[PDB]
Amino acid sequence: FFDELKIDNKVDIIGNNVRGELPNIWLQYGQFKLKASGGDGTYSWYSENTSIATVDASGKVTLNGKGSVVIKATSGDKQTVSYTIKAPSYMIKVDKQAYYADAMSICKNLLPSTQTVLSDIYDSWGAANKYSHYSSMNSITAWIKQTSSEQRSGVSSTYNLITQNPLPGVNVNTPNVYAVCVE
């Protein structure tokens, strides 16, 4: 005989091995295991809006779009338990490689206002290549909105999403630099 079915409040981030509430700042395509308990112990997972996110048979969730969505779990004894996903203050998207100005526009003038905006993601999710969608990369250098003075010097600084290598004085016309957006 079974007892109440639950989905643990604390998610388990795939890329940094940390158990705590779902981060409020999201990297796109980050993923994370949900812990379902109770019932006859046999669980089935379901997203009710893939556009925003996805979940697999084991409960590994993958953030795909910015929004709010309801992942649900159902057991064998026929109980169901929803785990709501809150809209994140911000979510970071990695677009194609482009020069700084060329990028600024791709991201619709929404580049990371500062380095923090990005390092903060690293602390929350970790080395971005510890995820499905990114696996094939050692590095993902990302432009940072340039300070007013950097503007005059045709340069700007950067931060990587895997290596955390903050680099300054980068000419705005240096190739091999992704145009990471922040919506």
Residue numbers in the entry: 752 to 934
Sentences from the paper on this structure:
Crystals of EHEC Int188 and IntN916Y diffract X-rays at 2.8 Å and 2.6 Å, respectively. Topological analysis suggest that Int188 is composed of sixteen beta-sheets together with four alpha-helices, which can be supported by the crystal structure. Both topological and structural evidence indicate that Int188 can be obviously categorized into two independent domains (Domain I& Domain II). Further structural blast revealed that these two domains correspond to an Ig-like domain and a C-type lectin-like domain, respectively. The Ig-like domain at the N-terminus of Int188 is composed of beta-sheet sandwiches which contain eleven anti-parallel beta-sheets (A, A′, A″, A″′, B, B′, C, D, E, F and G) and ten coils. Beta-sheets A′ and A″ between strands A and A′″ extend a platform on top of Domain I that contacts Domain II, helping to define the relative orientation of the two domains. A C-type lectin-like domain was found to be located at its C-terminus, comprised of two anti-parallel beta-sheets (B, C, D and A, E) spaced by four alpha-helices (I, II, III and IV). C932 in the C-terminal strand E forms a disulfide bond with the C858 in helix I. Strand E and strand A in N-terminus of Domain II form the principal strands of the first sheet.
The binding of intimin to Tir mediates the adhesion between the pathogen and its host cell. The intimin of EHEC O157:H7 is of γ-type (designated intimin-γ), whereas that of EPEC is intimin-α. Here, we determined the crystal structures of Tir-binding domain of EHEC O157:H7 intimin at 2.8 Å, together with an Asn to Tyr mutant at amino acid 916 (IntN916Y) at 2.6 Å.
